[PDB]
Amino acid sequence: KTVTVKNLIIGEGMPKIIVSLMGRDINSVKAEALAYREATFDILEWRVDHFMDIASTQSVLTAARVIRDAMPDIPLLFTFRSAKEGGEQTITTQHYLTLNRAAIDSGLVDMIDLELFTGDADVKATVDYAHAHNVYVVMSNHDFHQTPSAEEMVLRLRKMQALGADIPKIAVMPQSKHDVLTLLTATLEMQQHYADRPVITMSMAKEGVISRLAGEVFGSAATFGAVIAVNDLRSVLMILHNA
Amino acid sequence: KTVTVKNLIIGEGMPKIIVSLMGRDINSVKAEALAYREATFDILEWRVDHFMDIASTQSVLTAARVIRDAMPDIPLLFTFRSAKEGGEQTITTQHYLTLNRAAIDSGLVDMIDLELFTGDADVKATVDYAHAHNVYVVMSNHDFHQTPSAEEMVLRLRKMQALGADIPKIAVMPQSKHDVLTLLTATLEMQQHYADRPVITMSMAKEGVISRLAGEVFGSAATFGAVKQASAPGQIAVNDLRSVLMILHNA
Numbered sequence: 120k121t122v123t124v125k126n127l128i129i130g131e132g133m134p135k136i137i138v139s140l141m142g143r144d145i146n147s148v149k150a151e152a153l154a155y156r157e158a159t160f161d162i163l164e165w166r167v168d169h170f171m172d173i174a175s176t177q178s179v180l181t182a183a184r185v186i187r188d189a190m191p192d193i194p195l196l197f198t199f200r201s202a203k204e205g206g207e208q209t210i211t212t213q214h215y216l217t218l219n220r221a222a223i224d225s226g227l228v229d230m231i232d233l234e235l236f237t238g239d240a241d242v243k244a245t246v247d248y249a250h251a252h253n254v255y256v257v258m259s260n261h262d263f264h265q266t267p268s269a270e271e272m273v274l275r276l277r278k279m280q281a282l283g284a285d286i287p288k289i290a291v292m293p294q295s296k297h298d299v300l301t302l303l304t305a306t307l308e309m310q311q312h313y314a315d316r317p318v319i320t321m322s323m324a325k326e327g328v329i330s331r332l333a334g335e336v337f338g339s340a341a342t343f344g345a346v347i348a349v350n351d352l353r354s355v356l357m358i359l360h361n362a
Numbered sequence: 363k364t365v366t367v368k369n370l371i372i373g374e375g376m377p378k379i380i381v382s383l384m385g386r387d388i389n390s391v392k393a394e395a396l397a398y399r400e401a402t403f404d405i406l407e408w409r410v411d412h413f414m415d416i417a418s419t420q421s422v423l424t425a426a427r428v429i430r431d432a433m434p435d436i437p438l439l440f441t442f443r444s445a446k447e448g449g450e451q452t453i454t455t456q457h458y459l460t461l462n463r464a465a466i467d468s469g470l471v472d473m474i475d476l477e478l479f480t481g482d483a484d485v486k487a488t489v490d491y492a493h494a495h496n497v498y499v500v501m502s503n504h505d506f507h508q509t510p511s512a513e514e515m516v517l518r519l520r521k522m523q524a525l526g527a528d529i530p531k532i533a534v535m536p537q538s539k540h541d542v543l544t545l546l547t548a549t550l551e552m553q554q555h556y557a558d559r560p561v562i563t564m565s566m567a568k569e570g571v572i573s574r575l576a577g578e579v580f581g582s583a584a585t586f587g588a589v590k591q592a593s594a595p596g597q598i599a600v601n602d603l604r605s606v607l608m609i610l611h612n613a
């Protein structure tokens with residue numbers, strides 16, 4: 120069970136590499152997109168919460184259009200990370216759903232990130248809106264303080280599947296090396312027993328680095344890199360793939 | 363607590379890379395020793411059980427000498443892997459112990475591998491002999507069929523510490539990806555609660571490859587790579603191994 124966007128097959132082969140744009144304004148986003156021409160990666164994520172003028176739907180869509188036109192052939196993921204889940208600024212639930220609906224129906228993005236804990240009515244409505252417009256949903260959950268039990272994490276990933284996520288995603292903060300193994304254990308249980316679509320998981324920080332490298336083994340379909348450095352990430356993924 | 367051999371500090375920093383040399387005869391051993399000089403690794407293991415003149419103690423020591431001649435500054439580990447534990451040929455227990463004692467008292471090698479389940483009295487006697495001649499002991503155990511429980515693996519590693527091993531070592535065979543996590547769990551439990559010296563662990567085969575890469579995270583002090591041919595399933599090209607170890611170390 121895969122998700123194919125612009126010839127990229129998510130959920131088989133090597134895990135796919137996501138890089139994120141974090142600029143404040145149009146000029147900074149253009150500069151980042153230009154700098155990223157020299158990099159090799161699979162999916163471009165726009166981290167909208169790093170943008171300054173998020174109040175104006177027009178401003179957000181204009182930036183989305185610039186990014187889309189800068190890299191017309193790359194899978195493009197629109198992500199507003201709420202402060203609630205480790206992002207850079209707050210947003211009202213209603214304005215979050217306005218920006219996401221506008222991104223969806225504009226045709227400018229291939230995927231959106233939708234936080235599981237936004238609220239059930241809003242999640243279901245936004246999943247239906249995305250699907251109706253041929254946009255995929257990465258349904259996401261983040262704990263930047265600690266690592267829940269494996270049982271709790273698996274139930275969250277299963278709930279995302281039940282709510283229609285195309286790709287469930289969880290990211291958690293280890294407070295010990297043991298916590299990294301708990302995240303890998305949850306990942307593998309999902310992979311082997313409950314998943315019927317691609318899943319993304321990660322243990323954050325230095326301690327969790329191995330989780331960003333071992334997705335082909337334990338069942339994570341994608342991983343985030345920086346322009347871990349993207350070239351080093353690709354080196355390790357290739358070595359593991361061919362071992 | 364660490365083990366330092368010819369300036370290499372085992373138990374600190376990046377896991378140390380071991381490669382196995384596997385020649386059938388003296389001429390092949392010579393040739394492999396010369397060729398290995400340009401590969402980059404931390405410890406050379408001579409897999410003595412691949413040598414087809416083990417019948418002669420002189421032949422075995424001459425082969426060790428040829429390796430030492432070619433690589434005077436490399437930590438050198440003498441390993442006869444018994445047939446019982448996945449090696450190439452069956453020899454008597456007394457023959458196994460004689461070869462190890464001769465290696466020890468020759469001065470040609472820095473370390474020997476001694477299998478835990480050789481028998482407690484023979485193990486103790488051989489550890490004592492090694493230490494009397496300034497040779498370190500990698501005490502080892504292998505399960506080439508399955509992965510024991512994390513608790514059974516920890517039991518064995520702790521027994522090796524109790525018998526005076528300088529570096530306990532266990533290698534086990536995964537039948538599933540779950541079994542790989544079990545090996546990593548046992549490794550970490552040793553690092554955090556029981557180990558008071560360096561320990562080497564690995565899950566073998568393709569499924570276990572991540573365990574050969576993640577030693578710095580979970581507490582395995584060394585890892586095996588392949589120069590041209592692997593000495594156990596799941597070993598990858600030594601340069602690729604080194605690349606991954608460096609990326610993990612510096613992340």
Ligand SMILES: *C[C@H]1C[C@@](O)(C(=O)O)C[C@@H](O)[C@@H]1O
Pocket residue numbers: 382407409441443475502531533564566586593594595597
């Ligand atoms: C210690 C043992 C480990 C291997 O079995 C392995 O890398 O899996 C290779 C052998 O040559 C070593 O003796």
Ligand SMILES: [Cl-]
Pocket residue numbers: 213214215217218
């Ligand atoms: Cl709004």
Ligand SMILES: [Cl-]
Pocket residue numbers: 276277278280281313
């Ligand atoms: Cl489900």
Ligand SMILES: [Cl-]
Pocket residue numbers: 290343
């Ligand atoms: Cl993330």
Ligand SMILES: [Li+]
Pocket residue numbers: 200
């Ligand atoms: Li994120």
